[PDB]
Amino acid sequence: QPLNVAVVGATGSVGEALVGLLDERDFPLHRLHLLASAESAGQRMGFAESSLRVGDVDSFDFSSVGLAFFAAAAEVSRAHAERARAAGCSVIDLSGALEPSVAPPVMVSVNAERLASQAAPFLLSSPCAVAAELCEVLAPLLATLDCRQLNLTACLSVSSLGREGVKELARQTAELLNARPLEPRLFDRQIAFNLLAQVGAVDAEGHSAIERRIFAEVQALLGERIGPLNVTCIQAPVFFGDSLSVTLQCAEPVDLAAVTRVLDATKGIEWVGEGDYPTVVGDALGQDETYVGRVRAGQADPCQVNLWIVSDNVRKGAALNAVLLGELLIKHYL
Amino acid sequence: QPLNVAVVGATGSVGEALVGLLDERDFPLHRLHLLASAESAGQRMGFAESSLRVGDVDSFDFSSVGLAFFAAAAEVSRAHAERARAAGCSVIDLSGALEPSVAPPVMVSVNAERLASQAAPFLLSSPCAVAAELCEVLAPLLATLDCRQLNLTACLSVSSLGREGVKELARQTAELLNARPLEPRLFDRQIAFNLLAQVGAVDAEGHSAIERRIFAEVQALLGERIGPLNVTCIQAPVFFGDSLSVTLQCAEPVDLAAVTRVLDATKGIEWVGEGDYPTVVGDALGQDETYVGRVRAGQADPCQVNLWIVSDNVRKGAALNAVLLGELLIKHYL
């Protein structure tokens, strides 16, 4: 009957956005429990004008809740998500720690019908921001387009590395601007005014962890309706938001008007045309729409279509998608 | 007998780098004439420890020189490059103003054999930095790889817009960092900590001028040895250097070792492996090598290979390529 919710990792940037969204969207919960690692435990957070104590995830009784959003480090998910589900609590894990089979990635806008096959209590993953934003835009297009090759170049902001990344960028930028010795802390090289070729270390085949994750999730979410995905994630000196440059190679010449029509008609997507474009700073930050522009064909190949996508990785790609999934689970998986 | 050289646009950032390279590389000139628009005329520049007056291009007698580097605005080239050639002066135009047929793009590392068919006085284009850096890396690979599709996402620094772009970025960044009202001048939106989807306005088919240029030059330079090119140029909040993310779709599974071997063996290219990568700030700025890293196959497709390329757009992509072409014209087109 009453729905009790836990938010694990509540003090992180994604956890915090998710709690604000529960309040904003009037999520129909009875009791809300905010949890973090013993580190962050004991501090207070605002919710619905009231003030809540963050508790230690290690001490928490998950039988007390009916739904849990895991927005903490992957190690927290590994340590607790399955145990939480055994306790009767449905889990939405944003860290992807238990992908691909124990906790399959699910998105309402993409593969919601994949819920119909699990039995409650659920244990699901909500995709990383980049994969969520790519798939949200591609899903409605794939009813019309036959995509044979998909190229993604993702330019990631430093918020992808959490609040310390935001701090590192601001600090490095300042040191340089008033001519002080640059001293990197989170990195071993300059990130200010620089583009890094990769995000984090690469494996023996040259792929980074985020690239692996995006790849695994896109193939779980979209499946067979696309051909080979090629993913590059670059680190940009920007604070917030994902900026994606996508090329689709299709089977047939692309009806560009139909593409922009579909994007324009889809809820949660804002189509930008007439030679203007969205940006993370100008458009994406702090709001729910994923913005899509620069829809055009190849200069040579009418069978190619490019898209430019910008979205708030914290609020939209991660948090709102997780909450929308929770809203779906409430709605008909009562 | 004696070789007299003019540098048109000598006070611009590319013109200045080119003059320094003439001195550094001991270009065998007799007299050097520095020229600019009446704007910049009258100011002095260093060359070989001596001090030279910049003259007005409008007043200049091109019969006095045997070779001219046009590193000025495209309008200066349109107004003077052909007239200069009629006067007996061979022209290397870096602005691309007279492409593709009047002044064909030529690169020593790529299509030098295209010189063998024009008669002196020459009138040639040296490619824009991005096209030069792409082609320099692809040319030696195409002897081994059969490239069926080429995807380029180019992340351009603000120096691509000249010195005013550098100034705009520094000023906007500073305004934000000490919490002052942001006021864009060169742009109508924020560039600081932002990624712009395009560089400049787009045409009716959605392509920007730089994208058109890169496309036309790559097809003139590489020709038939590659399939369709797809180009996106993004504006990054970085001061100097081009950062390129390239995907090649090949006919056969790519021998990655052979790729890195070729790149490692090619003069002017620095191959970076072992999971490290070059950046514009860390590696490219102020030097001659074009750095290439992140050589890997697709996660799904062994027929795909990715490359990451960084180069100094001013010194290397534009200026050094132009000078190398001039050195070739001296060497056996005496």
Curated annotation (Swiss-Prot), chains A, B:
GO biological process: amino acid biosynthetic process
Alphabetical list of SUPFAM superfamilies matching this protein: Glyceraldehyde-3-phosphate dehydrogenase-like, C-terminal domain, NAD(P)-binding Rossmann-fold domains
InterPro entries: NAD(P)-bd_dom_sf, Semialdehyde_DH_NAD-bd, Semialdhyde_DH_dimer_dom
Name the UniProt record assigns to this protein: USG-1 protein homolog
Pfam family, one: Semialdhyde_dhC
Signal sequence segment: none
Gene3D superfamilies: Dihydrodipicolinate Reductase, domain 2, NAD(P)-binding Rossmann-like Domain
GO MF annotation: an example: NAD binding
Family to which this protein belongs: Belongs to the aspartate-semialdehyde dehydrogenase family.
Highest taxon, organism lineage: Bacteria
Disulfide bonds: none
